[PDB]
């Protein structure tokens, strides 16, 4: 199971948000920390992504594009996984030192988006997602959103995507006899991956609005963050870059 050996071997480690719990919760403090966390996890993503099977085959420019357009959905997915394995999707485990309880969910002014994130978190349990399905599914997320015109080398991006889809397909097909369960498992998981997009765009909208008035609410933005939210996110929000859905 070479492909799996690789995914498991290159999975990023535990990342701390550097949040000062001793401080009273406050919109600015919570968001400033999520943005710092966002900036840190972004580093691991780039290293994780580049060590992916057949990834460096993509034109160096499409490597930036895909990473830049899909980090939100990737980070939200993993985070939903950490939540599920730690605080059992009861709360939201963004980082070891930044766990969201109902109070903080309301305090950050994103309770609505958090409710949907926690739902996703529960899905891992309800659907009994295995550690292997999670990894193949999360790889797929990286290839799940592109510009409507196409990347530098679109022909090749689609190839890589096909292979990753075929992998998630084998992961299910292994340890499973006959064929309606497989066919059924594949339907549930592609539906799960789809449900990630709607949540992602909500956060894109939220963070963009946030950055614009950041200096009014005292919320800090790291440099790659403030950079990506105004140079790549705007094109997702304006319909230039679009998610690739499995189902209609």
């Amino acid at each position: 199971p070479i492909f799996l050996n690789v995914l498991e071997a290159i999975e990023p480690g535990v990342v701390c948000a550097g949040h000062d719990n001793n401080q009273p919760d406050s919109f600015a403090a919570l968001l400033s920390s999520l943005n710092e966390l966002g900036e840190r996890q972004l580093v691991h993503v780039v290293k994780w992504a580049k060590a992916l099977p057949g990834f460096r085959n993509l034109h160096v420019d499409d490597q930036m594009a895909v990473i830049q357009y899909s980090w939100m959905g990737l980070m939200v997915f993993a985070m939903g996984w950490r939540s599920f394995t730690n605080v059992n999707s009861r709360m939201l485990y963004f980082a070891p030192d930044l766990v969201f309880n109902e109070y903080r969910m309301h305090k950050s002014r994103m309770y609505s988006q958090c409710v949907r994130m926690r739902h996703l978190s529960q899905e891992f349990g309800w659907l009994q997602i295995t550690p292997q399905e999670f990894l193949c599914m999360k790889a797929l997320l990286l290839f799940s959103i592109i510009p409507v015109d196409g990347l530098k080398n679109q022909k090749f991006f689609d190839e890589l995507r096909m292979n990753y889809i075929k992998e998630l397909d084998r992961i299910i097909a292994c340890k499973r006899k006959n064929p309606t369960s497989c066919s059924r498992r594949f339907y549930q998981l592609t539906k799960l991956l789809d449900s990630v997009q709607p949540i992602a765009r909500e956060l894109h909208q939220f963070t963009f609005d946030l950055l614009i008035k950041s200096h009014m609410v005292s919320v800090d933005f790291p440099e790659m963050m403030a950079e990506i939210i105004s140079v790549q996110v705007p094109k997702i929000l304006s319909g230039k870059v679009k998610p690739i859905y499995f189902h209609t």
């Binding site: 580049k50 160096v60 490597q63 830049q68 790659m224």
Partner: peptide
């Protein structure tokens, strides 16, 4: 970008 780009072509 510029800081992102560097982490990649790295």
């Amino acid at each position: 970008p510029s800081i992102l780009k560097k982490i990649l072509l790295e």
